[PDB]
Amino acid sequence: MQIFVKTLTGKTITLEVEPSDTIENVKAKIQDKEGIPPDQQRLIFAGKQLEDGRTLSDYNIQKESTLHLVLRLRGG
């Protein structure tokens, strides 16, 4: 099913995921679409940061929902 991801650069992404996807795999699907290393990604939904040990359905995320993405300060 299809969701959205928004980033503070002003860009929006849409992508295809399963409700059983665990969040570090969603970070890896974002790495495949936009190049961003998973260790620099912070993913936010509904007033919290996400933990990668749980799935989109554990967070009650469904089609047409939006994730917010923030970049950490260090790399290279």
Distance between the two ends of the chain, CA-based, in angstroms? Answer: 34
Question: Residues near 33 by Cβ (< 8 Å), separated by ≥ 6?
Answer: 13, 15
What are the backbone angles phi and psi of residue 20, rounded to the nearest 5°? -90, 0
Within a 10 A sphere around the Cβ of 29, how many other Cβ atoms? 17
What are the backbone angles phi and psi of residue 28, rounded to the nearest 5°? -70, -35
